[PDB]
Design a protein around this ligand. Structure first.
Ligand code: A1CEF
Length: 457
């Protein structure tokens, strides 16, 4: 009745990204293979984010030097059965024109934030944030709550939804620490700018807490005259609790522009048909898509396929035992994958590069959430140790005790799988659910035994 209009307005955003991609592939003379190459997709997506960014670190993060009226990056072409790389400079003004023209005159800011969230999801599936966490005095075992930690510095409410409790705590703790070392960080006009940002992040984090006590604790943090060690400890205590008492963090399955493009190219009317990020739409679209990736001489194609599959599905922070059943193949922790990131650095030799057909399909599909068969997944060892770390006698409170009690009663109950079950892709209505069978021999976390590169660029 109303949800019909939300699907159409979402489909219109998807449609405009695809119209944009086709126009860029055409402008760049990219072949069908080249346009489906995910490295080409990333550069094109970064160029449009860059054109509207105006060096504000709102849509993307970049390094200053070069012409501010131009923008660009690597475009990969196939010449004589071999891969080559060129750095192109495209006028920012013309990129904006092509974007708005593809979005039938609209600025379509939502289209940009959807590409930005796809970039954040790829980084959450690729890079480790352990050193970043230890640099802020946080426990490196908070890794499972770092949703959207690579989002641009001044990204708005668009990124707020996809940020984790650990990301919110990291950003809030970084502010509290700056003011502890330097009390002048809260004085003057810069202080006024920062206090407004402090209170907004506190309310954004508070919104993710699903209990009265967790939220009431965030009230004390937001309304503290001069944030310090007391607020640092309350924030890390709350991050420890969010390991047992799960917050409400949105995981949006945003796909690359090289997926939406061919769908619009072959006549899909996303505005008319509608599009929902939740449910079968991303799954069904990934079954009717073909994406290529540049592969390094030492990489396993199945492992590069899993990294991109997990990034498309905003699933780096999901239980691998669940992911494995839905995908119909074992999803390995990052430490067990023989692959690096999708992006190719300029110091890399292109003569060694090859290409691979990414296997982005799934056996089943599922929705992100009368009588159920109680199917539980034990909490990961590292998350139990991290959650029950801090001392009860250290800093006392009434809200602290109630959260401790809530954690102590949730722990034996373990992690309950939510939903009717998984569904066949042919079952588009979701009427025949399948009984999920989980393997407890495999670990639950994607970050267990993690050997990934640290995010820096
Ligand atoms: C902690 C517990 C055990 C609690 O019970 C639920 C369970 C996770 O269950 C899921 C997780 C993810 C999806 C999912 C959904 C979408 C979507 N668009 O709806 C997608 O694109 N990709 C996926 C993905 F598999 F790939 F991750 C569906 C169901 O975790």
């Amino acid at each position: 009745q109303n949800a019909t209009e939300i699907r159409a307005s979402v489909g219109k955003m998807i449609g405009g990204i695809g119209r944009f991609y086709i126009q860029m592939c055409t402008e760049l003379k990219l072949s069908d293979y080249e346009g489906r190459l995910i490295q080409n997709s990333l550069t094109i997506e970064r160029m449009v984010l860059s054109a509207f960014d105006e060096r504000r670190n709102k849509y993307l993060e970049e390094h200053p030097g070069k012409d501010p009226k131009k923008t660009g990056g690597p475009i990969y072409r196939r010449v004589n059965g071999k891969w080559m790389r060129e750095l192109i400079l495209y006028d920012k003004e013309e990129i904006r024109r092509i974007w708005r023209q593809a979005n039938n005159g609209d600025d379509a800011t939502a289209g940009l934030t959807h590409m930005m969230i796809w970039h954040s999801n790829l980084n959450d599936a690729t890079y480790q944030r352990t050193r970043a966490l230890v640099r802020t005095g946080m426990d490196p075992r908070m890794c499972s709550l770092m949703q959207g930690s690579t989002l641009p510095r001044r990204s708005g409410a668009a990124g707020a939804a996809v940020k984790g409790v650990g990301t919110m705590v990291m950003e809030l703790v970084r502010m509290i620490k700056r003011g502890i070392n330097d009390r002048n960080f809260w004085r003057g006009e810069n202080g006024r700018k920062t206090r407004i940002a402090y209170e907004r992040m506190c309310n954004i984090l508070k919104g993710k807490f699903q209990t009265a006590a967790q939220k009431a604790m965030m009230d004390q943090v937001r309304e503290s005259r001069n944030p310090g060690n007391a607020e640092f400890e309350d924030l890390t205590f709350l991050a420890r609790s969010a390991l047992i008492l799960r917050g409400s963090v949105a995981h949006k399955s945003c796909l690359p522009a090289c997926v939406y493009g061919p769908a619009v190219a072959s006549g899909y009317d996303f505005e008319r048909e509608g599009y929902s990020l939740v449910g079968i739409d991303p799954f069904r679209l990934l079954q009717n898509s073909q994406v290529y990736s540049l592969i390094r001489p030492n990489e396993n194609p199945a492992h590069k396929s899993q990294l991109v599959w997990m990034a498309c599905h905003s699933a780096a922070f999901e239980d691998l035992r669940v992911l494995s059943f839905i995908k119909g193949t074992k999803v390995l922790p990052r430490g067990k994958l023989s692959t690096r990131g999708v992006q190719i650095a300029s110091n890399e030799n292109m003569e060694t590069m090859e290409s691979s057909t990414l296997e982005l399909r799934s056996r089943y599909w599922a929705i992100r959430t009368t009588f159920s068969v109680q199917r539980n997944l034990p909490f990961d060892r590292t998350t139990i140790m991290a959650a029950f770390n801090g001392n009860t006698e250290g800093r006392t409170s009434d809200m602290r005790t109630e959260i401790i009690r809530m954690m102590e009663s949730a722990r034996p109950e373990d992690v309950s799988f939510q939903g009717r079950g998984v569904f066949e892709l042919s079952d588009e209505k979701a009427a025949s659910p399948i009984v999920p069978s989980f393997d407890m021999s495999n670990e639950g976390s994607y970050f267990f035994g993690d050997n990934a590169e640290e995010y820096d660029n």
